[PDB]
Write a protein that holds these residues in place. Structure first.
Motif, PDB file in Angstrom:
ATOM      1  N   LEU A  89      45.131  14.593  -3.772  1.00  0.00           N
ATOM      2  CA  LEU A  89      46.689  14.637  -3.555  1.00  0.00           C
ATOM      3  C   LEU A  89      47.014  14.218  -2.172  1.00  0.00           C
ATOM      4  O   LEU A  89      45.905  13.900  -1.615  1.00  0.00           O
ATOM      5  CB  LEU A  89      46.889  16.191  -4.008  1.00  0.00           C
ATOM      6  CG  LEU A  89      46.232  17.012  -4.682  1.00  0.00           C
ATOM      7  CD1 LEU A  89      46.571  18.375  -4.571  1.00  0.00           C
ATOM      8  CD2 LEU A  89      46.449  16.552  -6.127  1.00  0.00           C
ATOM      9  N   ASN A 129      57.166  20.340  -0.549  1.00  0.00           N
ATOM     10  CA  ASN A 129      56.759  21.442  -1.438  1.00  0.00           C
ATOM     11  C   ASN A 129      56.080  20.691  -2.450  1.00  0.00           C
ATOM     12  O   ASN A 129      55.110  21.363  -3.177  1.00  0.00           O
ATOM     13  CB  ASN A 129      57.745  22.102  -2.039  1.00  0.00           C
ATOM     14  CG  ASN A 129      58.842  22.748  -0.997  1.00  0.00           C
ATOM     15  OD1 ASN A 129      58.175  23.623  -0.280  1.00  0.00           O
ATOM     16  ND2 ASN A 129      60.021  22.551  -1.307  1.00  0.00           N
ATOM     17  N   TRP A 159      53.293  17.588  -4.023  1.00  0.00           N
ATOM     18  CA  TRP A 159      51.839  17.041  -3.767  1.00  0.00           C
ATOM     19  C   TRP A 159      51.845  16.038  -4.773  1.00  0.00           C
ATOM     20  O   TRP A 159      52.042  16.150  -6.243  1.00  0.00           O
ATOM     21  CB  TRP A 159      51.065  18.035  -3.950  1.00  0.00           C
ATOM     22  CG  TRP A 159      50.342  18.874  -3.069  1.00  0.00           C
ATOM     23  CD1 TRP A 159      50.504  20.313  -2.686  1.00  0.00           C
ATOM     24  CD2 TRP A 159      49.924  18.587  -1.677  1.00  0.00           C
ATOM     25  NE1 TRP A 159      50.126  20.786  -1.741  1.00  0.00           N
ATOM     26  CE2 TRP A 159      49.642  19.560  -0.900  1.00  0.00           C
ATOM     27  CE3 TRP A 159      49.675  17.178  -1.048  1.00  0.00           C
ATOM     28  CZ2 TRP A 159      49.159  19.793   0.349  1.00  0.00           C
ATOM     29  CZ3 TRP A 159      49.035  17.265   0.142  1.00  0.00           C
ATOM     30  CH2 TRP A 159      48.847  18.302   0.751  1.00  0.00           C
ATOM     31  N   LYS A 208      44.755  16.082   0.369  1.00  0.00           N
ATOM     32  CA  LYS A 208      44.088  16.989  -0.083  1.00  0.00           C
ATOM     33  C   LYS A 208      43.264  17.000  -1.329  1.00  0.00           C
ATOM     34  O   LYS A 208      43.606  16.278  -2.333  1.00  0.00           O
ATOM     35  CB  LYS A 208      45.176  18.016  -0.088  1.00  0.00           C
ATOM     36  CG  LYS A 208      44.758  19.732  -0.789  1.00  0.00           C
ATOM     37  CD  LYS A 208      45.705  20.381  -0.771  1.00  0.00           C
ATOM     38  CE  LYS A 208      45.548  21.951  -0.933  1.00  0.00           C
ATOM     39  NZ  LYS A 208      44.767  22.020  -1.947  1.00  0.00           N
ATOM     40  N   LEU A 267      58.381  29.191 -18.834  1.00  0.00           N
ATOM     41  CA  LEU A 267      57.108  28.712 -17.691  1.00  0.00           C
ATOM     42  C   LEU A 267      56.356  29.615 -17.484  1.00  0.00           C
ATOM     43  O   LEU A 267      56.089  30.730 -17.610  1.00  0.00           O
ATOM     44  CB  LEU A 267      58.322  28.474 -16.652  1.00  0.00           C
ATOM     45  CG  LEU A 267      59.779  28.228 -17.148  1.00  0.00           C
ATOM     46  CD1 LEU A 267      60.723  28.116 -15.761  1.00  0.00           C
ATOM     47  CD2 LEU A 267      59.742  26.713 -17.423  1.00  0.00           C
ATOM     48  N   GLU A 314      48.055  25.147  -4.439  1.00  0.00           N
ATOM     49  CA  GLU A 314      48.769  23.713  -4.822  1.00  0.00           C
ATOM     50  C   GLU A 314      49.857  23.815  -5.549  1.00  0.00           C
ATOM     51  O   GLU A 314      50.810  23.167  -5.607  1.00  0.00           O
ATOM     52  CB  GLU A 314      47.767  22.873  -5.467  1.00  0.00           C
ATOM     53  CG  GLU A 314      48.158  21.442  -5.907  1.00  0.00           C
ATOM     54  CD  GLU A 314      47.407  20.846  -6.592  1.00  0.00           C
ATOM     55  OE1 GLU A 314      46.070  21.119  -6.944  1.00  0.00           O
ATOM     56  OE2 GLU A 314      47.984  20.301  -7.824  1.00  0.00           O
ATOM     57  N   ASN A 349      54.736  26.596  -5.572  1.00  0.00           N
ATOM     58  CA  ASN A 349      56.213  26.326  -5.710  1.00  0.00           C
ATOM     59  C   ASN A 349      56.551  25.662  -6.887  1.00  0.00           C
ATOM     60  O   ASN A 349      57.774  25.492  -7.232  1.00  0.00           O
ATOM     61  CB  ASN A 349      56.308  25.411  -4.638  1.00  0.00           C
ATOM     62  CG  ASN A 349      56.405  26.110  -3.141  1.00  0.00           C
ATOM     63  OD1 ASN A 349      57.075  27.228  -2.778  1.00  0.00           O
ATOM     64  ND2 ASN A 349      55.875  25.277  -2.262  1.00  0.00           N
ATOM     65  N   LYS A 350      55.568  25.452  -7.700  1.00  0.00           N
ATOM     66  CA  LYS A 350      55.889  24.750  -8.917  1.00  0.00           C
ATOM     67  C   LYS A 350      56.045  25.710 -10.182  1.00  0.00           C
ATOM     68  O   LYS A 350      55.337  26.662 -10.364  1.00  0.00           O
ATOM     69  CB  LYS A 350      54.931  23.513  -9.202  1.00  0.00           C
ATOM     70  CG  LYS A 350      55.252  22.756 -10.650  1.00  0.00           C
ATOM     71  CD  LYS A 350      54.673  21.339 -10.299  1.00  0.00           C
ATOM     72  CE  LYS A 350      55.320  20.613 -11.710  1.00  0.00           C
ATOM     73  NZ  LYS A 350      54.783  19.201 -11.626  1.00  0.00           N
ATOM     74  N   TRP A 351      56.697  25.120 -11.290  1.00  0.00           N
ATOM     75  CA  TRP A 351      56.722  26.065 -12.529  1.00  0.00           C
ATOM     76  C   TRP A 351      56.403  25.205 -13.781  1.00  0.00           C
ATOM     77  O   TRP A 351      57.258  24.190 -13.833  1.00  0.00           O
ATOM     78  CB  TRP A 351      58.416  26.723 -12.761  1.00  0.00           C
ATOM     79  CG  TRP A 351      58.463  27.729 -12.142  1.00  0.00           C
ATOM     80  CD1 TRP A 351      59.696  27.922 -11.123  1.00  0.00           C
ATOM     81  CD2 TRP A 351      58.099  29.090 -12.339  1.00  0.00           C
ATOM     82  NE1 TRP A 351      59.608  29.447 -10.798  1.00  0.00           N
ATOM     83  CE2 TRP A 351      58.640  29.778 -11.361  1.00  0.00           C
ATOM     84  CE3 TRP A 351      56.941  29.641 -12.977  1.00  0.00           C
ATOM     85  CZ2 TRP A 351      58.092  31.566 -11.444  1.00  0.00           C
ATOM     86  CZ3 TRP A 351      56.383  30.963 -13.029  1.00  0.00           C
ATOM     87  CH2 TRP A 351      57.124  31.684 -12.374  1.00  0.00           C
ATOM     88  N   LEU A 402      64.729  25.836 -21.564  1.00  0.00           N
ATOM     89  CA  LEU A 402      63.885  25.395 -20.433  1.00  0.00           C
ATOM     90  C   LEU A 402      62.887  24.475 -20.499  1.00  0.00           C
ATOM     91  O   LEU A 402      62.427  23.769 -19.408  1.00  0.00           O
ATOM     92  CB  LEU A 402      63.269  26.530 -19.439  1.00  0.00           C
ATOM     93  CG  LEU A 402      64.258  27.642 -19.322  1.00  0.00           C
ATOM     94  CD1 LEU A 402      63.849  28.860 -18.886  1.00  0.00           C
ATOM     95  CD2 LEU A 402      65.588  27.460 -18.606  1.00  0.00           C
ATOM     96  N   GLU A 420      64.778  29.016 -10.297  1.00  0.00           N
ATOM     97  CA  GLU A 420      63.670  28.186 -10.848  1.00  0.00           C
ATOM     98  C   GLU A 420      63.650  26.791  -9.965  1.00  0.00           C
ATOM     99  O   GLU A 420      62.584  26.391 -10.093  1.00  0.00           O
ATOM    100  CB  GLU A 420      63.914  28.036 -12.429  1.00  0.00           C
ATOM    101  CG  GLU A 420      63.078  26.897 -13.051  1.00  0.00           C
ATOM    102  CD  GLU A 420      63.037  26.652 -14.273  1.00  0.00           C
ATOM    103  OE1 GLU A 420      62.680  25.753 -14.697  1.00  0.00           O
ATOM    104  OE2 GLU A 420      64.135  27.360 -14.866  1.00  0.00           O
ATOM    105  N   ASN A 476      63.236  25.003  -5.152  1.00  0.00           N
ATOM    106  CA  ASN A 476      62.349  24.324  -4.309  1.00  0.00           C
ATOM    107  C   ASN A 476      62.228  22.649  -4.906  1.00  0.00           C
ATOM    108  O   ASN A 476      61.198  22.192  -4.307  1.00  0.00           O
ATOM    109  CB  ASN A 476      60.858  24.595  -4.531  1.00  0.00           C
ATOM    110  CG  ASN A 476      60.844  26.131  -3.813  1.00  0.00           C
ATOM    111  OD1 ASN A 476      61.210  26.111  -2.352  1.00  0.00           O
ATOM    112  ND2 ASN A 476      60.219  27.242  -4.124  1.00  0.00           N
TER     113      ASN A 476
END
Ligand SMILES: [Ca+2]
Ligand SMILES: [Ca+2]
Ligand SMILES: [Ca+2]
Ligand SMILES: [Ca+2]
Ligand SMILES: [Ca+2]
Lengths: 218, 218, 189, 189, 189
Positions: free
Chosen positions: A72, A156, A158, A209, C43, C124, C127-129, D71, D124, D127
C-alpha cells in the motif's frame, strides 16, 4: 562426568515474522520530502496537445523499486515545480493543474485549464526563483511557479501499489479507484517547431505500508 | 509605488545532485543484520546431488528490489542457519560450506565437503537451538548448526550488482570476478523418496553504494 | 459490534504431488454464525481477523504449513517459500505444531507461546466500510475491481509435496467485525 | 458547504405492476440547483440527504407508500412490504397524509408529527469523498463498480397495486453536501 | 444488543366472523432481520417490543382497531371490546388514523399524538433468558408448557364485523432484544 540425554519425538519451530519488518525490510516507510525529475515541458504544434502525468510511485525512478517491496501507499505531498531554461525572448506560457476524477476530460484551452485543481500559469521564462526550492523543504516563494496536489483528501485512504499502466478498455470509473489524480501540463502557444523551454521537477512525500514479495507485486 | 524591471537575456539553472542522495534515495545504504529465508534442505536419490546458492543480493526477496537502486555492494555478514523440522527418527546428516573460487568444483562426498570454507555438519534433526538466532544479532550457541562466510576477504572490494544469472558459456574465471562465493548444501544419506527435513535461513548484512537508475541496472 | 467470534475456516489439505495453496477471501460470508448475522446488514469493517492453526496429526508427520495475507487482489499468490516469507503476517510451523493456540479460541489474549497464528493488521481499514457480498468473484472480473470490496486474501501453503494426500490440521478464525446498515437478508447479495 | 437545499425529486407514481418501484440514485446530478453548483467541483460528500413525502390527493385514496435506502449497489430492490421494511431508514404511511412535513422544506428541524421522511445515515461517508459523476450507469457496468461512486440508492414503492396510474404525492429532497476540488463544469463528467 | 429494529409484523385483517382476532407470538423467529440475527444465538431477552399501527385506508372507513398483550399462554383470547380493554398495554383507535406514528419507525422516541401503539412491559423479563425456538407450538402441547418459552402473545381484533374482508392498515414492530450464548444456526431449533 555423565550428562543425561532425552531426545524429543521430533524437533521443529514456529516462525512469526513481524517486529515491524519482514524479510529484513520495514513494513512501514516514509520517504520524507524528496525531489526528483518529473519530465520536460514539451511544446508542439497542436492546440489540443497537453501532457498528462499519473500520480504514482512509478514516477519516482530510484524510489520506484523500493516501493515494489510494499503493498500500500499514500501521497502525503505531491508538488510540481516548473524551472525555466530558455531566452526571455521566448513567447507563450505554461499552464498546470490536477484532475481529481479519472472520468473528467482533459482541458483543451486556457479558460478550461484555469479551473483545474491547484491551477497555476506563467510565461515560459518565468519562475526562475523556483530553483531554490529543489532538494529543500522550503515553501514556495518569489516568482516560483508551482502546483501542489491537496493531499488532505487522501489522509484516510490507502492505495494499492499498481505497476501496470491503465488500459484503454478500462472503465474510467475503475481506473479512478487506484489513481489518486492526474497532473496536466499545457501550452497556450502552439509552436512551429517542437521545443522544450523548461523542466518539471517533483517535490513529493509518500508512505509505503504492508510487506509483500516484489515479484508478486502487480 | 514604482518598481524597476531588468530581465536577463535568458533564464536557467545549474543542478548538481548529491547531498548524499540522488533522486530521493540515499547514495549509501547499510542493511544491518537481517534475517530472511534462503531455501529448504532438499534430499534426493543421487549421491552427487547437492544444492548451490550464489552469494548475491538477489537472494533477498524484499531487499532485492531496494538493491536495484544501487550500483555497488559488499557482503559484511552472510551466515546460514539450519533449522530442523522432522522426527528424531530421521536418519542422515547435512553438510554445508562455502566455495571461494567459482572455478573450484562442487564436493561430491563427505571427505571432500569437509574441506570447504566454514564447513559444518549435523544429524538432520539437530540444531534446534538455532531458532533463537533468528531475527536477533546473537552469536551462535547451543547445538546451533551454522556456517558463516568469512567476509573479511571482501572488506576492500566493491562488487557490481548483477541481476542476470551466469551462463554456461561463461568462463568460470570471469564469473568469479562478480560472485563473492557459492554456498553448498549436501546430504550424505541418499533417500528413496525426496523430502525436506529442515530449512536454511540467512542472517546477512550488506552495503549498497552508488546511485543508478534501477531500469538501467543489469 | 459482534465481539470476538470463533469460526471454523476449513481444514488444511495437502494434495499429493503438489504443494498445496488454499486461498481464503477475507469476508464473513461463509462463516457459520458470523455469516448469518452479517446477512442482515449492508456494511462491515474488520476489527480483528486472525487465523490460528491447530494440528491434528502425529509428531512423525513431515512438512510445515505457511500462512500470510495479500493486501492487493492484483498481487499474485506466492508459489514458493522465499516468496511466501515476504507476505504480511507470515507464519510457518511444523505441520504438527500449534497445540498451544487452543486457548485462543475462547479467549481474547494476544497470540503467544508456541501458538501458530497469523493476524491481519486491521488498522488499514479503520475508516472504511465494505459492502457485504455473498457471491464469488467472476473469473472475468478485473482484479482492481475485486480489490475494492475484498479487504484482503489469506493464503495457506505447504512447504513441500507429499506422497499421500492428508489433512494435518484445522484452520480457525478469531474475528471481530462491525456491522452497519439495514437490509433484508434475502436481498443482500 | 452548500447548507440545506430543497429539491424536487419527482412524483410518487403508482402503476399496475406489483414489482413496480421507483429508484433514485443518491447524487446531485439531477438536482435543479445543487446539480448546477456541484458541476464546478470535482468531489463531494453527503452530510444530510433526507426525502420528505407530501400528499396531493383526497383522503379517500387507499394504499400506502414505502421508502428506504439501499447501501450496496449489488443488493436487489425489495419487491414486497416484508423486505422493504428492512431497508435503511425505512418509513411508510398512508398515501394522503404527511402534512406535518411541509415545514421541513424551509426549516432544518427534525421530522415530527405525521411527517413521512427517510434520511440517509451520512455518518457512513464522513471520511470519504466521491467523484461527482454526470453520466448514467452503463447497463453492462458491473454493480460492484457502480457501487464505488454511488453512495446509495433511494427506493419508493406502493403496497397497493392500482387499476389506474396516478400520482398521490410528491417526493422532496432536502440535502446538504460538501464540495471539494475545482474543475471546469464542461470538463466535469 | 440488537438496538431498535423495525419489522413488518403483518397486515390488519378484518373478516366476517366476530370472534375473529389475529394472534402473534412474541418471538424473533418470523422477523425478517431479527430472525436471521437471532438464529446464531441460543438465548434472548426482550428489552423493547412495541407494535405501531399505521393506516392505508380512506377516512370514510368505519370501525376501530384494538391491540393488547396476553402474558399467560393459558389465558383465553378476548372476544369482545369490554374484555379486550383489560389486556396488557391495551390501545385502540379508529381504523384510518394513527399517522403521527410513522416517525416512530426510524426514531426511538415515544408514542405521541394520534399514534396508535402497544408496548410490551419488558421489565417483567429483566432477570431471565428465553431459549430461542423456531418451531410452532404443537396443537397438543400443554398451554403451561408453551408458556415457558413464550414471553407473551400480542392480540389484534376489530370491533366492527365487516361484510367484505379488507386490510385497513399495517402492523409494525419496533423491538430491541438481547442475545446470548452461541449456537450454530442450523442447530438452533
Ligand atoms: Ca500490488
Ligand atoms: Ca549493475
Ligand atoms: Ca450486499
Ligand atoms: Ca467528475
Ligand atoms: Ca434453540
Amino acid at each position: 562426568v555423565s550428562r543425561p540425554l532425552n531426545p524429543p519425538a521430533a524437533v521443529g519451530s514456529t516462525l512469526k515474522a513481524g517486529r515491524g519488518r519482514t524479510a529484513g525490510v520495514s513494513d512501514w516507510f516514509d520517504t520524507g520530502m524528496i525531489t526528483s525529475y518529473l519530465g520536460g515541458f514539451q511544446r508542439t504544434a497542436g492546440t489540443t496537445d497537453s501532457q498528462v502525468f499519473i500520480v504514482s510511485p512509478a514516477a519516482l525512478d530510484r524510489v520506484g523499486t523500493i516501493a515494489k517491496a510494499y503493498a500500500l501507499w499514500r501521497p502525503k505531498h505531491w508538488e510540481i515545480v516548473y524551472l525555466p531554461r530558455c531566452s526571455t525572448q521566448t513567447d507563450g506560457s505554461i499552464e498546470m493543474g490536477f484532475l481529481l476524477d479519472y472520468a473528467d476530460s482533459v482541458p483543451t484551452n486556457t479558460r478550461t485549464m484555469a479551473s483545474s485543481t491547484s491551477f497555476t500559469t506563467s510565461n515560459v521564462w518565468g519562475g526562475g526563483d523556483g530553483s531554490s526550492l529543489l532538494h529543500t523543504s522550503m515553501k514556495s516563494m518569489g516568482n516560483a511557479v508551482t502546483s501542489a496536489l491537496p493531499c488532505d483528501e487522501f489522509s484516510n485512504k490507502w492505495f494499492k501499489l499498481s505497476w501496470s499502466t491503465p488500459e484503454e478498455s478500462e472503465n474510467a470509473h475503475l481506473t479512478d479507484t487506484y489513481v489518486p489524480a492526474r497532473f496536466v501540463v499545457r501550452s497556450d502557444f502552439p509552436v512551429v517547431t517542437a521545443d522544450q523551454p523548461g523542466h518539471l521537477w517533483l517535490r513529493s512525500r509518500i508512505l509505503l505500508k504492508g510487506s509483500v514479495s516484489p515479484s508478486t507485486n502487480l
